[PDB]
Amino acid sequence: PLESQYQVGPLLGSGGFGSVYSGIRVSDNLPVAIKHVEKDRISDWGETRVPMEVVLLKKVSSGFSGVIRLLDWFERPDSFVLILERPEPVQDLFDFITERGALQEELARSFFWQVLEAVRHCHNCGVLHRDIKDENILIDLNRGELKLIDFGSGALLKDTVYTDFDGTRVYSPPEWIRYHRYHGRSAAVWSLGILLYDMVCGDIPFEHDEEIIRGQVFFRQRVSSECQHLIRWCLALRPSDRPTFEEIQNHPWMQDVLLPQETAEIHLH
Ligand SMILES: Nc1ncnc2c1ncn2[C@@H]1O[C@H](CO)[C@@H](O)[C@H]1O
């Protein structure tokens, strides 16, 4: 009877993922997030038959704080209720970039690095997010830690080809736009490339399908040669020409990353 262990609060947000309410867990007054999803609105299920999002979060919710952990969940007549952690204060990368504009490379380095550790975490756990982007990245302003959210478009990690994709088009790779097919790890790397550009330029690089398939990336902001190189590498047109997570984390631009707390005092506090 979820309607007792938690006390609902204001509506944090809503959209193509459901409706999320701020809440508190009467038992330790733990700040939580309560997400509602209508059964009629989901297409992927796994296992009892629960929405894929729950299966994904469960395999990924133990320990490492790179992803928002799923604390619990309940089933209702026509929907599922998810109890997620809720850091405070917090701000998603989209709003953060929208307010501060392009990020200094030291900050983008720390942020990108943490996203990479989080993505490696999910992959290691057999989960592919499929919708990595600013909006799905939460920033814990006080600890300087980022956390991944909304695995609603995710899928179990597999080595074979994918033929479905309901993520964010502007963050989709050329192979999806042209052949309606892609592979997990390399598609993920491509979106990682869009994200990085978004961070240091303050906006995504491609708007139209033609631009995505063209691959030419123009910089509207001043960014180091090393950063431009990593970005271009992640955005290689041919999937196999993209770097592996290891190659990204070993890239020259990725060295000397700040620690989360250091990031918070220098850039967030
Ligand atoms: N687990 C969560 N904890 C805190 N806030 C969240 C969580 N999931 C979604 N949100 C809020 O809802 C918005 C929807 O993208 C996010 O920007 C964030 O503000």
Ligand 1 atom at shortest distance from the alpha carbon of 95: 17
Please tell me the number of Cα atoms within 13 Å of 20 on its side-chain side. 15
Residues 74, 119, single domain; the answer is: no
Instruction: Tell me the CATH number at 223.
Output: 1.10.510.10
Domain residues for 80?
Answer: 1-88
Nominal resolution in Å?
Answer: 2.4
Give the span between the Cα atoms of 234 and 144, in whole angstroms. 25
Listed residues 59, 88, 117: the one ending a domain: 88
* DSSP of the chain: -HHHHEEEEEEEEEETTEEEEEEEETTTTEEEEEEEEEGGG---EE---EEHHHHHHHHH-SS-TTB--EEEEEEETTEEEEEEE--SSEEEHHHHHHHH-SPPHHHHHHHHHHHHHHHHHHHHTTEE-S--SGGGEEEETTTTEEEE---TT-EE--SS-B----S-GGG--HHHHHHS-B-HHHHHHHHHHHHHHHHHHSS-S--SHHHHHH-----SS---HHHHHHHHHHT-SSGGGSPPHHHHHTSGGGSSPPPHHHHIIIII-
Question: Would you state the structure tokens that stand for residue 235, as one six-digit string?
Answer: 């955005």
Q: Do residue 61 and residue 110 come from a single domain? A: no
The C-alpha atoms of residue 133 and residue 171 are separated, in whole angstroms, by 7
Among the three residues 88, 106, 132, which one is the final residue of a domain in this structure?
88
Structural domain total, the chain: 2
Span from the CA of 151 to the centroid of ligand 1 (angstroms): 12
Ligand 1 mean position, distance from CA 259 (Å): 23
Which of 60, 88, 116 is at the close of a domain?
88
Whether residue 98 is found in the same domain as residue 79: no
Question: Distance from CA of residue 55 to its chain's centroid?
Answer: 17
Let me know: does 53 contact 82? Beta carbons within 8 Å: yes
